[PDB]
């Protein structure tokens, strides 16, 4: 089974640069041609930069609106691609995938992506309290707990319940900026028997501060 | 740039249904080695896009046959006979006949029978107290169709500033929707009052939702 991994994204200040990091793994790193696509909530997917094999001499292909910006680099020993990027303007803002271009002239594997936000703002630590009820009757399925992440930035953060070992009946609704605050929810039902019995906690992870979070909701 | 014009935009589909999504270009799409390279992606809720069909309409490996493509001229199609719970998501369609370039997208949107939706609320926590403000949280649960509204009554009269409701994505299981409304009083507020109660709203009833705590 293919994998593919990015990564070292976060906030940056209008101005200054980063590197993103690519490993692949199931495939002949060599024998392919690597990708680096972004996706930003207005220019939809687009492509930035194309690497090549030994043979192909190691040339690059700057989508125009890059050239001299971003640079795409590989080592096949290690199996990775890198892109520098230098002089992130807003615009540079957007998810980042690495991808392959496969025989069939297409990327065909990619990676789960990155974020990366170029703004004047500054990071903020996400703020987790505590969903749970509200002392009532059982009338409900059987019992929902959750965490309310509030006030932080930027994007994303991602929740996961027990670990993660808890993806049945897991519900997450989307950020909502305001104030300058992106905030979300989420909420995960259980047997109102397995509980408190059990052990349930969250994990919200905010990448842009290196900060995963592990909190658990209890009878109050 | 090679212009591509996705239609539609949204698109819901019964189980079972066709779905059809078309995907043309600003200009002519044929390779000089004579190979038209038009491929379409699948990127599911919180996912990475997949690779579905490569060379107008070949499939890629593991793809059901369920998923067929087609060109001709500009215009090239996508269509998703038997259609299914797992099959939502934005499809996009890209080139790589030239400076490669992607398609708008279209979101497959399963279409299923109403449901109604369970609620559940959620009085503030001492530990958001200190931050000088107070949040109640209405969430509805398991719900069919997308929309419906809500409203938040404080000791009867009702409240409509501090709101803010956000949906989840349509799960991929039972293509159901939720939803929170959240309600932010500040400190002194939530305090000055003792009734707080949210009432839904939504297609399977005409009696309102009615759910609440005293403190």
């Known amino acids: 089974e293919v994998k593919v991994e990015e990564s070292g994204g976060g906030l940056v200040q209008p101005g200054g640069s980063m590197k993103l990091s690519c490993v692949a793994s199931?495939?002949?790193?060599?024998?392919?041609?690597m990708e680096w696509v972004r996706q930003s909530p207005e220019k939809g997917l687009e492509w930035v930069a194309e690497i090549r094999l030994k043979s192909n001499n190691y040339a690059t292909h700057y989508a125009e609106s890059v050239k001299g910006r971003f640079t795409i680099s590989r080592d096949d020993s290690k199996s990775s691609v890198y892109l520098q990027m230098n002089n992130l303007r807003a615009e540079d803002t957007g998810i980042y995938y690495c991808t392959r271009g496969g025989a069939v002239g297409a990327m065909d594997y990619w990676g789960q992506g990155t974020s990366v936000t170029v703004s004047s703002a500054t990071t903020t630590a996400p703020s987790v309290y505590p969903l749970v009820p509200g002392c009532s009757d059982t009338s409900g399925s059987s019992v929902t707990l959750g965490c309310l992440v509030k006030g932080y930035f930027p994007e994303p953060v991602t929740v996961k319940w027990n670990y993660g070992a808890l993806s049945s009946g897991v519900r997450t609704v989307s950020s909502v900026l305001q104030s300058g605050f992106y905030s979300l929810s989420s909420l995960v039902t259980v047997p109102s028997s397995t509980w408190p019995s059990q052990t349930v906690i969250c994990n919200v992870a905010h990448p842009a501060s290196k900060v995963d979070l592990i909190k658990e909701p209890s009878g109050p | 740039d090679v212009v591509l014009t996705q239609t539609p935009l949204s698109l819901p589909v019964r189980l079972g249904d066709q779905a059809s999504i078309s995907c043309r270009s600003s200009?002519?799409?044929?390779?000089?080695?004579?190979?038209?390279?038009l491929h379409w992606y699948l990127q599911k809720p919180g996912q990475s896009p997949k690779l579905l069909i490569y060379?107008?309409?070949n499939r890629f490996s593991g793809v059901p046959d369920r998923f067929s493509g087609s060109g001709s001229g500009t215009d090239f199609t996508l269509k998703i006979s038997r259609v299914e719970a797992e099959d939502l998501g934005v499809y996009f369609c890209?080139?790589?006949?030239?400076?490669?370039?992607f398609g708008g997208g279209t979101k497959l949107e399963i279409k299923r029978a109403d449901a109604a939706p369970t609620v559940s609320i959620f009085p503030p926590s001492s530990e958001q107290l200190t931050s000088g403000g107070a949040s109640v949280v209405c969430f509805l649960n398991n719900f069919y169709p997308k929309d419906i509204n809500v409203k938040w009554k404080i000791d009867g009269s009702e409240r409509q500033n501090g709101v803010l409701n956000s949906w989840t994505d349509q799960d991929s299981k039972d293509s159901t929707y939720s939803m929170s409304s959240t309600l932010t009083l500040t400190k002194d507020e939530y305090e000055r009052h003792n009734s707080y109660t949210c009432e839904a709203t939504h297609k399977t009833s005409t009696s309102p939702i009615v759910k609440s705590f005293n403190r």
């Open positions: 890209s080139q790589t006949t030239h400076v490669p370039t």
């Open positions: 199931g495939f002949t790193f060599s024998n392919y041609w």
């Open positions: 200009q002519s799409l044929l390779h000089s080695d004579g190979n038209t390279y």
């Open positions: 060379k107008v309409s």
